């Protein structure tokens, strides 16, 4: 009675594919054809933040567009002042293998996690004047891959156990679990309204989750390999993904399908990170070949290149007001472009 | 003004304290050897540990040198994402139990680790385990799999243990040469392999890890000078 449901799923997915093909009427490269290009984008390294001992695996900007946190495999979280280049905090972690870090939208907390399967919350205000662990969210069965604050009391975490989870920080329990993926969940992105979030996994599929209900609204296929990065379009109606098959995609939400592919022949390395500019016109993407590419998110043509890292580009973040880009790399340097 | 200058100089003093602490941590970091203890299902690496949660840490000293060994637990059977976190360790200790076909699985995993693009500068200290268990392997099962074991002559070069039957010697050198056939087809000279025969009860395993870490550091130093 297994082949019964296998065949029924085959017919249902074929019906969904036919509906998707019916809703398509004209490519995005046919509607943005008469628009004018962005020219050549030229950014320059403004700052270079030095001080990490091992490779940098993640960074995250604050909402004031000045401070940023950064995670390294030496066991340190460093909070930087990006205007003055001064270090503000330097937090030694219990486990050296950290794969994610997050900065609270209020600037009061920092989270990190990695191969120890724990998300540790760090109080930064701590009137006593001592950055100490305020919470330890245990319960995942695989390594922590991403984490993002919704409030100072809730946080969404993805894990290498193929699940995401919504946590209650002050209580310590996970109030929701999101189970649809068959591979490692590598990344997640919150919508501007934080009622939805999208998450890509190692099964080559992305999923849209309702945070307050706890179900999978839609599922987005189209990539051939593992999805390493995922980001929302500034208005919350589309999202871009970066994969190991050396392409990016645009994936409209209300059309329920993919709009555009950002590929190039001499690019045969995987994408590690993606981000949009404030207007959503440029799509920045970090690669395994030590470089970043500025993509025209509407014409699919390449606009610029951010060269200057000597190892793998691991993380990438555009600031909240759109005034600078920060890239971290496995060479243990953070650079700020403009 | 006054408050702007006070804030800026307080920022500078905090940055100086932080950089002082980072200078102090850099010396402890540079003077430690990080090892990734990896293994398979049958292969008992806990006997390698008893002589020395998502990850376990084990600190031990050899001749005033500090070693830091990590063994993954509570991680799924898919290693392609989290194995990249271990490209800057000094060595991957690969424990394999010589005796489903577990040896072909060990060989495929060693091939995957060897030929990965991020682990192509990491050395592998291979521990071919349970050589004594091969002594009670007298019935004639290493012939079902690996049919090229019939026309195999033991290497007269290497010398076995005094008082060992030739079956175990030929079998263990055949398996060592399987792993060496994998590790030699590279033709690189950028990362090196150290095959050892170990057992459940031993004393020289720590000394072996120490000697191979020394050799790894010496080859890295000689490549920075372009003498190798």
């Amino acid at each position: 009675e297994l082949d019964q449901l296998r065949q029924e799923a085959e017919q249902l997915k074929n019906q969904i594919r036919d509906a998707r093909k019916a809703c398509a009427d004209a490519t995005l490269s046919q509607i943005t054809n008469n628009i004018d290009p962005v020219g050549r984008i030229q950014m320059r390294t403004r700052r270079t933040l030095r001080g990490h001992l091992a490779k940098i695996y993640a960074m995250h900007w604050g909402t004031d567009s000045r401070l940023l946190v950064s995670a390294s495999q030496d066991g340190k979280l460093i909070i930087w002042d990006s205007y003055t280049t001064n270090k503000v905090h330097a937090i030694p972690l219990r486990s050296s293998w950290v794969m994610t870090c997050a900065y609270a939208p209020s600037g009061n907390y920092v989270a990190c996690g990695g191969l120890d399967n724990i998300c540790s919350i760090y109080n930064l205000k701590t009137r006593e004047g001592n950055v100490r662990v305020s919470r330890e969210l245990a319960g995942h069965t695989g390594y922590l891959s991403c984490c993002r604050f919704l409030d100072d009391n809730q946080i969404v975490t993805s894990s290498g156990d193929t699940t995401c989870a919504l946590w209650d920080i002050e209580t310590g329990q996970q109030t929701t679990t999101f189970t649809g993926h068959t591979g490692d969940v590598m990344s997640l992105s919150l919508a501007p309204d934080t009622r939805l979030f999208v998450s890509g996994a190692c099964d080559a599929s992305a999923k849209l989750w309702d945070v307050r209900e706890g179900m999978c609204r839609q599922t987005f296929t189209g990539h051939e390999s593992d999805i390493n990065a995922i980001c929302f379009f500034p208005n919350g109606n589309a999202f871009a993904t970066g994969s190991d098959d050396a392409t990016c995609r645009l994936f409209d939400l209300r059309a329920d399908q993919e709009l555009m592919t950002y590929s190039h022949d001499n690019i045969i390395c995987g994408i590690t990170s993606v981000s949009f500019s404030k207007s959503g016109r440029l799509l920045l993407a970090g690669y395994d070949d030590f470089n970043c590419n500025v993509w025209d998110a509407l014409k699919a043509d390449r606009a610029g290149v951010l060269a200057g890292h000597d190892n793998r580009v691991s993380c990438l973040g555009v600031t909240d007001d759109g005034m600078a880009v920060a890239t971290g790399s496995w060479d243990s340097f953070l650079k700020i472009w403009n | 003004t006054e408050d702007q200058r006070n804030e800026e100089k307080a920022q500078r003093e905090a940055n100086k304290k932080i950089e002082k602490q980072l200078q102090k941590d850099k010396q402890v970091y540079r003077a430690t050897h990080r090892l990734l203890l990896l293994g398979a299902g049958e292969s008992g690496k806990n006997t390698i540990v008893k002589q020395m949660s998502g990850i376990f840490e084990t600190k031990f000293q050899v001749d005033k040198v500090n070693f830091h060994m990590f063994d993954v637990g509570a991680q799924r059977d898919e290693r392609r994402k989290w194995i990249q976190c271990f490209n800057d360790v000094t060595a991957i200790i690969f424990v394999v139990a010589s005796s489903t076909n577990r040896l072909q699985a060990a060989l495929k995993l060693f091939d995957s680790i060897w030929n990965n693009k991020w682990l192509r500068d990491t050395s592998v200290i291979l521990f071919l385990n349970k050589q004594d268990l091969l002594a009670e392997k007298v019935l004639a099962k290493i012939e079902d799999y690996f049919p090229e074991f019939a026309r195999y002559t033991t290497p007269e070069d290497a010398t076995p243990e005094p008082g060992e039957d030739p079956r175990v010697t030929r079998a263990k050198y055949f398996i060592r040469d399987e792993f060496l056939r994998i590790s030699t087809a590279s033709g690189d000279g950028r990362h090196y392999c150290y095959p050892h025969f170990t057992c459940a009860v031993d004393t020289e395993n720590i000394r072996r890890v120490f000697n191979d870490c020394r050799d790894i550091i010496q080859r890295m130093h000689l490549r920075q000078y372009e003498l190798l």
Partner: nanobody
Amino acid sequence: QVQLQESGGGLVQPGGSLRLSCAASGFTFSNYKMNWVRQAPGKGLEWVSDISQSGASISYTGSVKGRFTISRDNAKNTLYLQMNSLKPEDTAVYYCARCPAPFTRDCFDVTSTTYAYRGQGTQVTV
């Protein structure tokens, strides 16, 4: 979407022969190394054979070397396994697996549970 569909079934008498085939869909078949994997009744998944992108490098497990033949048709996006001189220990469900990423040498795809780019199998009974 990535999907793999195998075809070929039992039961064949000992000494017979059958040819497994797999129709790939959803990816550039020419960029990936392909494998054959099998699961005997009451055991884990074990690796059988693999072929490289062009078809030059070929490798077999120990107990099939000489009897089986792997080959791929990059134009038709198809993978074949020609099984000759079958023995009763070849009874197993055979899955076609794909390397996780393109232009690579390594592969991590014998995962005895929940690997994404593997087919759903086809039963072989000798």
